[PDB]
Amino acid sequence: ARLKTVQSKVTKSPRRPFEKERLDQELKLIGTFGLKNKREVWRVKYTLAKVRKAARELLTLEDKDPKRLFEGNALLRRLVKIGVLDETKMKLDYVLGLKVEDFLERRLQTQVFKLGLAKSIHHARILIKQHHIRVRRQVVDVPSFIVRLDSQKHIDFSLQSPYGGGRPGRVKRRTLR
Amino acid sequence: GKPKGLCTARKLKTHRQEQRWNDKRYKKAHIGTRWKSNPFGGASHAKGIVLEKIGVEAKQPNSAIRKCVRVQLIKNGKKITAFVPNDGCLNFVEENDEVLVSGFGRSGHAVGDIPGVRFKIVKVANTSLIALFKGKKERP
């Protein structure tokens, strides 16, 4: 009959639930990049830790290992295409230097207000929620959506939004009526 | 010292198995009478009926009378004492009442200054005792 659906976790809780240093640092990160909850940042931390642990497991092997070559090139490729890893920094011995801020900057929510599409990060989030942003002719309503290097330059206002060209909003229609 | 020869695997394994029985946790989990001795029969929750209510002198240096109720489990008919959390909740427990009971937290050990009491009431008359204390509901 039906099978087991394949699931997987992305968030790993810290071993110490409370410590002023981590609490304050993570609060500061939430402030810098508009996020919803600490799970958001733990997700990025655990993706980063998966990346770093895989890179370390690879570096434990010597340089020209077939697996090392394939995985390291692929991982550097993925980070490059996302726009986190530097394209002049091609090595895992150097990928072992990254932070959550790097991946968090590559969220749509940041780019919206970064490139002048919104005043505040909160305004950017509510605009995306109300469907006033678009990417490569693709209305993405997911703030954590991950913006690649290529798509970095392919975001403008929605082709249907009142602010991107369309019918006036509900308030404007009320006033006109 | 322990044996170290390259052909002593049988001795090492047999000795380890023999000495595991001197461990409280392993013996407690593999004795075989756990189900017969444990009132809940290995479960986490159980249901029962009230018989009477008692006040237990809290241990020294604490001075108070903790208000518990003697209950009879429906699964096996065993008699236990269950604690009624929160203030003025014994009022909501009347003799001959159906109660849901759970562990107190220390896995069959008494908790705090209440002597010999290792269970606690989680529902009375199909109502949550916390709801009864908080006024979210009333006695059926």
């Binding site: 039906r2 099978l3 077939p66 394939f70 | -």
Partner: protein
């Protein structure tokens, strides 16, 4: 169970068919005959996945009832027929001819061919014996038994079998210096030149084979099929010419 089985679950189906995990609870079971369950393919799977000729299996059965498909030149209407290795499939209405072949990965690929190609096929000699009346026969690994064959034909040798004439044309030998296919093992879909033969008396013997790229690997006899003499292949091979690319080489080829 109390008797034979008729079904075959999707997961238990051989992996080489590449059947999507979320694509139903059963897999079309090949019926007994020329080939074996783990070393064949259903015509229904052919028409549904490889050629996209059928959106659904009802459509596959509809196409198959029309008696338009030929296998070995014999019109089949069994969607569960065991179309396996070195099997000729000729859809006359569309005038399309295919021969079953093992991809480097080991999968079966749509190997388009012409009429001259479709007109023949190869068979390995599974045994040679003497049926009643004193007429010697040979049995091939695909079950085909051929009467009155050339006496020099022996075990593990290849014979060209003519579909149109149902006769043995040529007899290629299993000896050092013959292009040999590799059907099973982890070297399924690998073509290489036979070399030395480690002879185990009471167990399957071992063969050494080196491909055109020079890579060498060994295997058991039962996985070794001769497909020619010297270096020439008696049939056309798919794009790849029986060479295993390592993963880095495959990526390099991709970009």
């Amino acid at each position: 169970m109390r008797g034979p089985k008729k079904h075959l679950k999707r997961l238990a189906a051989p992996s080489h068919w590449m059947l999507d995990k979320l694509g139903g609870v059963f897999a079309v079971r090949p019926n007994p005959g020329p080939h074996k369950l783990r070393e064949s393919l259903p015509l229904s799977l052919f028409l549904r996945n490889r050629l996209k000729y059928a959106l659904n299996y009802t459509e596959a059965k509809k196409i198959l009832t029309q008696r338009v498909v030929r296998v070995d030149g014999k019109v089949r209407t069994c969607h569960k027929f065991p179309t396996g290795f070195m099997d000729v499939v000729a859809i006359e209405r569309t005038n399309e001819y295919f021969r079953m072949l093992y991809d480097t990965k080991g999968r079966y690929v749509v190997h388009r061919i012409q009429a001259a190609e479709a007109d023949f096929k190869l068979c390995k000699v599974k045994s040679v014996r003497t049926v009643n009346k004193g007429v010697p026969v040979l049995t091939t690994t695909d079950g085909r038994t051929i009467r009155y064959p050339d006496p020099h034909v022996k075990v593990n040798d290849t014979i060209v079998f003519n579909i149109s004439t149902q006769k043995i044309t040529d007899s290629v030998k299993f000896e050092p210096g013959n292009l040999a296919y590799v059907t099973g093992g982890r070297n399924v879909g690998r073509v290489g030149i036979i070399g030395h033969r480690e002879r185990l008396p009471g167990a399957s013997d071992i063969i050494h084979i080196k491909d055109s790229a020079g890579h060498s690997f060994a295997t058991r006899i039962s996985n070794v099929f001769v497909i020619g003499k010297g270096n020439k292949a008696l049939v056309s091979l798919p794009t790849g010419a029986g060479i295993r690319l390592s993963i880095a080489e495959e990526r390099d080829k991709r970009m």
